[PDB]
Amino acid sequence: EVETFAFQAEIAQLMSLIINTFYSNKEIFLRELISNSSDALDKIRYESLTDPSKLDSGKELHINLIPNKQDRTLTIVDTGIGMTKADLINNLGTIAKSGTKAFMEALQAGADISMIGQFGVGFYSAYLVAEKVTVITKHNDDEQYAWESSAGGSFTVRTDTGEPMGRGTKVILHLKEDQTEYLEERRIKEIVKKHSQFIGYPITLFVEK
């Protein structure tokens, strides 16, 4: 059972700008998603200091980067706090509305796309490199869900029946045909070293076979 939702007009406008604007510095998408994963890990860590049982769904706090050339996907997995259904459908978009307005004001004031993460909408930089984004997520207080959007003004949410995750978020980037460099080990290593060198969680770059 798949539910289809419309993005808010302002968010759809931001995704169109990300997809259609000429901007060669696409590699910043990885910095932004790793930063989001680090924030999600900080949140479950801090919550567990006063309720240890919040880690019953998984004690390890980490980030995995998993490329797959056969599927042409780059997957960013974290074991952070995850997202509720209300997060996916309402709450993140409510924050993103004011951040988007602030970001697009900065952009016409001379700022550039790389600054997007300061406005809370860094997740959408995924569409610099991905034609479709699938997000699998599990919060301690909700079920496992799959969020998915190919932009174009709508996204879907369904209950996810696949491999149970325990807790956290998996972002699956279905890469555009001309962005397969982000499946190469040396390229991902370069980007992590350049932009994410001091993240306080183990980042494991998986190799393919």
Ligand X SMILES: N#Cc1cccc(-n2cccn2)c1
Please give the annotated binding residues for ATP, written as ranges: 36, 78, 97, 123
Options 15-23, 89-97, 160-168, 188-196: segment touching ligand X (CB under 6 A): 89-97
Task: Tell me how far the alpha carbon of residue 187 is from its chain's centroid.
Answer: 19
Q: Which amino acid belongs to residue 171?
A: V
Q: How many residues sit in the footprint of ligand X (CB under 6 A)?
A: 10
188 contributes a contact to ligand X by CB under 6 A: no
Going by C-alpha positions, the residue among 199, 204, 192, 200 that lies closest to residue 28 is 192
| Strand pairing report for 203-205 and 144-149 | unpaired
Question: What distance in Å separates the CA atoms of residue 165 and residue 75, rounded to the nearest whole number?
Answer: 14
Question: What distance in Å separates the CA atoms of residue 127 and residue 133, rounded to the nearest whole number?
Answer: 8
168 contributes a contact to ligand X by CB under 6 A: no
Which of 18, 34, 77, 92 lies at the binding interface for ligand X (CB under 6 A)? 92
121 contributes a contact to ligand X by CB under 6 A: yes
* Nearest distance in Å: CB 44, ligand X: 14
* Nearest distance in Å: CB 126, ligand X: 8
As a residue count, the chain comes to 209
Question: What distance in Å separates the CA atoms of residue 198 and residue 196, rounded to the nearest whole number?
Answer: 6
- Are the beta carbons of 63 and 81 closer than 8 angstroms? no
Which of 96, 128, 165, 203 lies at the binding interface for ligand X (CB under 6 A)? 96
Which of 28, 61, 165, 171 lies at the binding interface for ligand X (CB under 6 A)? 171
Binding residues for ligand X, per CB under 6 A? 88, 92-93, 96, 121, 123, 135, 147, 169, 171
